[PDB]
Amino acid sequence: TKPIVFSGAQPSGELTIGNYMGALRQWVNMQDDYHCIYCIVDQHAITVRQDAQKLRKATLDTLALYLACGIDPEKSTIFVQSHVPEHAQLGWALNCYTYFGELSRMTQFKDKSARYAENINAGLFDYPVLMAADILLYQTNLVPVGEDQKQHLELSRDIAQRFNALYGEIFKVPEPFIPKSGARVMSLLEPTKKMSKSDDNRNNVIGLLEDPKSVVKKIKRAVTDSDEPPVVRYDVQNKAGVSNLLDILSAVTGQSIPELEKQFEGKMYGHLKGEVADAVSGMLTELQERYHRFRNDEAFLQQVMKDGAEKASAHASRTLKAVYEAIGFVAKR
Ligand X SMILES: CC(=O)c1ccc(C#N)s1
Ligand Y SMILES: Nc1ncnc2c1ncn2[C@@H]1O[C@H](COP(=O)(O)OC(=O)[C@@H](N)Cc2c[nH]c3ccccc23)[C@@H](O)[C@H]1O
Closer of 34 and 109 to a copy of itself (Cβ): 109
Touching a copy of itself, residues 59-118 (CB under 8 A):
59-60, 80, 82-83, 85-86, 88-89, 91-93, 95-104, 113, 117-118
- 13 belongs to the binding site for a copy of itself (CB under 8 A): no
- Closest by CA position to 224, among listed 241, 206, 203: 241
Residue 179: strand pairing partners: none
Nearest to 144 by CA among 40, 28, 10, 26: 26
CB atoms within 10 A of CB 221: 10
Number of residues that bind a copy of itself (CB under 8 A): 61
Piece of 10-18, 86-94, 151-159, 231-239 that binds ligand X (CB under 6 A): 86-94
Q: How far apart are the first and last CA of the chain?
A: 29
Say how far apart CA 59 and CA 76 lie, in whole Å. Answer: 18
Pick between residue 28 and residue 41 the one whose CB is nearest to ligand Y. Answer: 41
Give the integer Cα–Cα distance in Å for 225 and 307. 50
- Cβ of residue 66: shortest distance to a copy of itself, in angstroms? 14
For the window 271-310, what string marks contact with a copy of itself as x by the rule CB under 8 A? -------------------------------x--xx--xx
Is 172 an active-site residue?
no
Q: Could you confirm whether 112 is annotated as catalytic? A: yes
129 sits near ligand X (criterion: CB under 6 A): yes
Give the closest residue to 39 by CA, choosing from 68, 69, 63, 3.
63
Residue tagged active-site, from 197, 220, 267, 311: 197
CB-wise, 38 or 264, nearer to a copy of itself?
Answer: 38
98 contacts ligand Y (rule: CB under 6 A): no
Residues 6 or more apart from 148 whose CB is under 8 A from it? Answer: 22, 107, 108, 184, 194
Contacts of 78 (CB under 8 A, 6+ apart): 38, 40, 63, 66, 67, 71, 304, 305, 308
Among 7, 16, 19, 47, contact with a copy of itself (rule: CB under 8 A): 47
Cβ contacts of 155 within 8 Å, gap of 6 or more: 98, 102, 106, 128, 132
Region of 121-129, 140-148, 169-177, 220-228 interacting with a copy of itself (CB under 8 A): 121-129
Measured CA to CA, the distance from residue 136 to residue 155 in angstroms comes to 12
Task: Name the site residues for ligand Y (rule: CB under 6 A).
Answer: 6-10, 18-19, 21-23, 41, 44, 131, 134-135, 143, 145-146, 148-149, 152, 182-185, 194-195
Contacts to ligand X by CB under 6 A: 88, 91-92, 95, 126, 129-130, 133
Catalytic residues: 112, 194, 197
